[model samples]
Target chain A: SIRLPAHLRLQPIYWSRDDVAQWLKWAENEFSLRPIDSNTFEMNGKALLLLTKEDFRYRSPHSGDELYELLQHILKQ
Target chain B: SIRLPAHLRLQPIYWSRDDVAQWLKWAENEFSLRPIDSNTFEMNGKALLLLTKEDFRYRSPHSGDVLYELLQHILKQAGPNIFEMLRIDEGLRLKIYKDTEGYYTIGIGHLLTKSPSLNAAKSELDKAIGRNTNGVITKDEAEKLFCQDVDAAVRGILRNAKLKPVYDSLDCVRRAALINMVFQMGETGVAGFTNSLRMLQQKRWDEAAVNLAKSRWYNQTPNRAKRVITTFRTGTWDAYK
Candidate 1:
């Protein structure tokens, strides 16, 4: 997982598809969760930011809860 | 009689018709000769350079010898850093955005899709920012990429053998014009301006400007084309700065 400089990091709303992939990769390494295929999240930052906890659970049964918690932490910041 | 600066006089090859006329006015005053009608000279610096002593004599019987001597003196004189101009023209954007043609672009008009693949651009961005970027970069990082892009453009301009001498002969302002063209259209695309480049090499400024005006590039980016073409015709940095 890369440690991004504060100014270089965009708000979740402004992320590109590549940014979304990077986020997923970061989440996997940070949480030591099972590997997630970025292809499954083939969406931009807006779409990723709009997903609900229920949506995360529906998408990934194994690590959905942790992923949703981490997303909430990011949003609250 | 207006005494032009040494820098301007040195590049007589790039002079416009009006500039040639201006020289005629100066020559008339400097030599105390009869009124030489500029209309009779009706040529640019390129054509001016080719005029033989006999041609000058035929054009102005009273002052041909003086004019020939003056031309030789002017010829003896010796001859952008395009970054700021391009920055103003291209603008700065810290976030990745779609350019007018829908290609992914970021930071001072750097085309991610063209040079560094999207993946590589992201990787480089990450490295620069010291962490994963969310399609954003710092001003410093943006400038770094901009420098790289401009260097590539310069290299492209220098690589063309046909263009090298033309590029070499040009004043800095005019060289920036050429570099701007190369930056907008790749070297190959600029190479397609065969007649225009020939006119430029000949220092036929008006003809070269007119040839560029006739292109699709002019139609597509009229504002930028107008500025660049004016720079070519005038051999001045006014259009850029």
Candidate 2:
């Protein structure tokens, strides 16, 4: 079973600014996408959750959709 | 801070049957809801996540909606466990020391006063660690004490009848802010912020933040106060960072 670590169990709505960054880094590695600058996404989980597909695409043109999908998967988990 | 025991540390989606039961019991207590039949939830975390509102209603007709809402609420809004946030606010200390108020304290701001005397705290630590402690403790022991203190804080917050709905309405991040405040000052100390608490209950985030900012707590620990007030205002974990 795919299990998240304790620190990562906090849902996206509760993620800290640092947790957002951590999610970005993990998404990049998990999807083998190009490096997305976490500094550009300097918001908390609540804000991150609100970002639209277009918004993600705007920030990371190459891997925005992948990131968005991954986030959806996490939310559904 | 110390690590949670393996069972308590699992993500909701990774919970075993017993973990799910324990969480159900905790939820019942935390939300002041009716007792849940844990035996009915003998399943893994993954299966629990797949359960629907209808399924809950079938399992617990009286408390199903509340249970479903709580699960969704936790899934969407629960932040890092309050322990991590408290650890950041209250640094770990292995040895006993006096707090600013000169109260005897140790291990993540655990108070050892005339009631639970210093010897009591130390003795409990010794038993848990299997080693005698002379006013000194390992991080593990400190964490154990911290967990107990957190439980006390939570119980204190819930004990106030007026605060129950407020606490229930808050997102986990905001809940942590309240818990942090209660941790520093007793529940009564926090209860004194009547207006702020009311504003919080009303979901008037800005007003609540402003109200809290006007307190003595704000002046006493500007840094911590700012972080907490901002968390209250923003409903995010950014400030705690």
Candidate 3:
């Protein structure tokens, strides 16, 4: 599960899909996460893009703040 | 000077630049107008979106009923409520400030460094923000920038190969249902639901819902997904469980 840092409410607005895809690639590389599909990424068995199965509305709490730090190179929430 | 069809005393409403741009793009597609700026475009040389310099406040005389319809359609599609929601989501700022993540943002989430239009006009912006050392933007200015961003988003969605084909095949509610999805995820995110897009393209309505339900997006925001999928399946905008 991807847990957004409690301190931040970020939204990344992109001009295009190419930019979003590019950002995802950067995120995967920056983090240790690897792509499981064309869009899906996973560090272990947990999907990087998904919240936990228990509560899909939130990010995985296991995700560190660094995930969001890497996200800033793309856009904010 | 462009002239509008009838004497519609239109009061200025909350319209974004992207709203105008999206409507303009749709209008161009709808009216069969060739590629040209919105100000001087007219079937009979009637300007549609832009007003004449003589009265920058109002529409021109060369405009016709079609132009009126076009504006109305644009407004209806990009309604004020939608604009308000976006404002709420993006939040607002009069002066340039670093976001929580440290991005330089101002006036409703306009990224000053990333946006060339805002960056290029910083000197002029000082005047608007009153001898601006650090530029400030009024709500109107923020709205203008917001419009520009959304327009870019719209253009992106329309140009996407996987998404555009699905988008072009629908109209009205059908189009709008996907518009919201594309609005949030970009075409890449939306296209990730390969089964959903394929089912939608094939007009396999139930199959489309099943596919939509299977995604992380649906799990994260089931209500929104339900609404969109409902709209997708029924070609109706309001019917949702």
Of the two candidates 1 and 3, the one with more favorable lDDT, higher being better, is: 1
- Measured against the true structure, the TM-scores of the candidates, in listed sequence, are 0.47, 0.49, 0.40
Q: Which of candidates 2 and 3 reaches a greater lDDT?
A: 2
Angstrom error at residue B195, model 2: 1.4
lDDT of 1 at B218: 95
Question: What would the per-residue lDDT of candidate 2 be over residues B130-209, giving only the tens digit for each residue?
Answer: 37776787665675676566667878888997677788889877888888898888888988887788899989998888
lDDT of 3 by residue, B9-68 (tens): 121254345334444455444443333356533332123344533332133222232344
Across A1-77, the per-residue lDDT of candidate 2 in tens digits comes to 33555687887777877887887887677668998886657655654664568657766899988888878888888
Q: In order, what lDDT does every prediction score? A: 0.71, 0.72, 0.50
lDDT by residue for model 1 (B137-219), tens? 87656756765666687788788886777788888788888988888888899888877888888899998888899899999
What is the DockQ of the complex in model 2? Answer: 0.01
Q: Could you list the CA RMSD of all candidates, in the order they appear?
A: 31.2, 18.6, 24.7
lDDT of 2 at B73: 55
Q: After superposition, how far is residue B203 of candidate 1 from its true place, in Å?
A: 1.0
Looking at candidate 2 chain B, the ten consecutive residues that score lowest on lDDT are: B1-10
Off by over 4 Å in 1: A1-77, B1-79, B114-131
- Winning model by lDDT: 2
Q: TM-score for candidate 1, please give it.
A: 0.47
